[PDB]
């Protein structure tokens, strides 16, 4: 079998294949996560270079791993499917053996572990994907939001963004997100998430996707018109 060490150290102590995988993430469409007091919102950018697209059937950017946890990503689309499938299988395996659904931290730790493994195994390249994993632990009302990257490191975030122009939207979030008082309602959280994407997106039309996750497996994706109403209200307050 093909055993070639593709991920190796360089004289300055860098693993370039892992670092180049991060450059693939930089190219991917922007993804953002914001947790309120009783919810988490995942926002995603859709590049409008592709019209004549069939939006009914085209792969959506946010994926349910279980009924209570969701995963979004920035980077190689094909690579992300492999991580999503593995995470979904592990979620069902956990329910089968522990008789309890995965915690958000456990699912994050698993996906991050798979990513790390692909950085020191022979004959494989690292995933060109960073992920945002959000949801609620079983029988818990505390919001959870984690981030993973190609190297396999992971951490928890009050709010975070990944992908192209994520430096700009992180700038916005760092001055607009208060830890002592997070977005108290679904409305406030969605509004802050749409606002953060409007710093980068272009037209607020079919370019912004929004998914809201609440406790006890309550997950819903907002439609074009619902998001369009947030887009309308934000700019009418801005004209002042």
């Amino acid at each position: 079998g093909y055993d070639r060490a593709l991920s190796i150290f360089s004289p300055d102590g860098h693993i370039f294949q892992v670092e180049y995988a991060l450059e693939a993430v930089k190219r991917g469409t922007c993804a953002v996560g914001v947790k309120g007091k009783n919810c988490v919102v995942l926002g995603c950018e859709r590049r409008s270079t592709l019209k004549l697209q069939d939006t009914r059937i085209t792969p959506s950017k946010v994926s349910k791993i279980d009924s209570h946890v969701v995963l979004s990503f920035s980077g190689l689309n094909a690579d992300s499917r492999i991580l999503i499938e593995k995470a979904r299988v592990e979620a069902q395996s956990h329910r089968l053996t522990l008789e309890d659904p995965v915690t958000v931290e456990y699912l994050t730790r698993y996906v991050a572990g798979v990513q790390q493994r692909y950085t020191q195994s022979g004959g494989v390249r690292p995933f060109g994907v960073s992920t945002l994993i959000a949801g609620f632990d079983p029988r818990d009302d505390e919001p959870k939001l984690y981030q993973t990257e190609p190297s396999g490191i992971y951490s928890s975030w009050s709010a975070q963004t990944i992908g192209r122009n994520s430096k700009t939207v992180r700038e916005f979030l760092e001055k607009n997100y208060d830890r002592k008082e997070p977005p108290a309602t679904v409305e406030e959280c969605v509004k802050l998430t749409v606002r953060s994407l409007l710093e980068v997106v272009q037209t607020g039309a079919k370019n912004i996707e929004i998914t809201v996750v609440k406790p006890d497996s309550d997950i819903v994706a907002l439609s074009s018109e619902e998001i369009n109403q947030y887009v309308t209200q934000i700019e009418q307050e801005k004209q002042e």
């Binding site: 190796i8 150290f9 300055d12 102590g13 860098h14 020191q120 022979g122 709010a159 975070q160 992180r170």
Partner: protein, 235 residues
């Protein structure tokens, strides 16, 4: 290109030497061994204020009598920790006893040189392994990706290590109390860290014979930081 297991003209393995450079870029970790216990402390180094810092886990329990702190590519440490935990538990299963701290360290270090064309590269992380056993008392070890491990009275690893080690050279003596060691780790971490040290960007832990391995609360560490500030202002 060239083999992953190649020797340099000086008789050193290229990949091992390069992984040591990655560890130099890692956040600082410090350990101090006393006759009352061993203290372990780390710099958390969050990349952004929106990152919830209590999710940064650079100090980890291996068993009740053995703790561990890391510096470098911290994702690489996860399989090393998994192996260490498995080895500690397996020995207890086979022998109805605690494993020696040195034996645990040796088992972790056996993984290090298992790379080639086994894993595709060495680990990019260094570990400080601290613990207690009945035969050799309180112990602190430094485990490297070369497979070598040294025992230390005190040791610092990561980006601020050589400045910290010089400081540990002057401060350590064989009569240090546990309280004195805690303040000493805080003092030296504060010296080498970029950002100002507080209970949210630094973490303390210890291992004692009585209570075992414990990660300190942010409230407990905050008091020790206040105690440090006052005694430095006392002269």
């Amino acid at each position: 290109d060239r083999g992953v297991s190649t020797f340099s003209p000086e008789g050193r393995l290229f990949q091992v030497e390069y992984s040591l450079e990655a560890i130099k870029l890692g956040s600082t970790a410090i350990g101090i061994a006393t006759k009352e216990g061993v203290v372990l402390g780390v710099e958390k180094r969050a990349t952004s204020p929106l990152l919830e810092s209590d999710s940064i886990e650079k100090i980890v329990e291996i068993d009740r009598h053995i703790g561990c702190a890391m510096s470098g590519l911290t994702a690489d440490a996860r399989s090393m920790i998994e192996h260490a935990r498995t080895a500690a538990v397996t020995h207890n299963l086979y022998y109805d006893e605690d494993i020696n701290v040195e034996s645990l360290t040796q088992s972790v270090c056996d993984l290090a040189l298992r790379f080639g064309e086994l894993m595709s590269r060495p680990f990019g992380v260094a570990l400080l392994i601290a613990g207690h056993d009945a035969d050799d008392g309180y112990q602190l070890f430094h485990a490297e990706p070369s497979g070598t491990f040294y025992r230390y009275n005190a040791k610092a690893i990561g980006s601020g290590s050589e400045g910290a080690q010089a400081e540990l050279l002057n401060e350590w003596h064989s009569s240090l109390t546990l309280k004195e060691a805690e303040l000493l780790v805080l003092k030296i971490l504060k010296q080498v860290m970029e950002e100002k040290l507080d209970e949210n960007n630094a973490q303390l832990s210890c291992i004692t014979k009585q209570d075992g391995f414990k990660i300190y609360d942010n409230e407990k560490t905050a008091e020790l930081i206040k105690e440090l500030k006052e005694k430095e202002a006392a002269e």
